[PDB]
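S2.1 Query sequence (acyl-coenzyme A binding protein)
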Amino acid sequence: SQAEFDKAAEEVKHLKTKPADEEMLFIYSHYKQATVGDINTERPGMLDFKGKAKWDAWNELKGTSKEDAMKAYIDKVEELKKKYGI
Ligand SMILES: CCCCCCCCCCCCCCCC(=O)SCCNC(=O)CCNC(=O)[C@@H](O)C(C)(C)COP(=O)(O)OP(=O)(O)OC[C@H]1O[C@@H](n2cnc3c(N)ncnc32)[C@H](O)[C@@H]1OP(=O)(O)O
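Output structure tokens follow.
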């Protein structure tokens, strides 16, 4: 009964396959909000698309609380569970 979400955040890494950057997109935003909180980082370095995708997706959430973030984060790591099959 902790950040089981943070446990999902492990699963999504174990998926037999680096999910599609677009599903990663969502996962990041909720993940990052839940673990970090209201984005204190900058827009893209070495991986533009990616860099913002994560930044941008999260940045979208800034203001939302860690747990709400979890609720959907988790449910979305859940999607990988199926998409890829962990
Ligand atoms: C469209 C671009 C991504 C959308 C925004 C970020 C997505 C984050 C949510 C999903 C987490 C990644 C899911 C698995 C993806 C892969 O597997 S791709 C890497 C090759 N690895 C594998 O196949 C095995 C598992 N992978 C890994 O352990 C890492 O390489 C990992 C995927 C976690 C990170 O690699 P990658 O996505 O290629 O680039 P990063 O910039 O290093 O990470 C993406 C962003 O997500 C944050 N992050 C790191 N680890 C996680 C986990 N476990 N869950 C969720 N989010 C994670 C990073 O902080 C990074 O964003 P930023 O902070 O902006 O750089």
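The helical segments are 4-14, 21-35, 48-61, 66-85. The chain has four helices and no strands.
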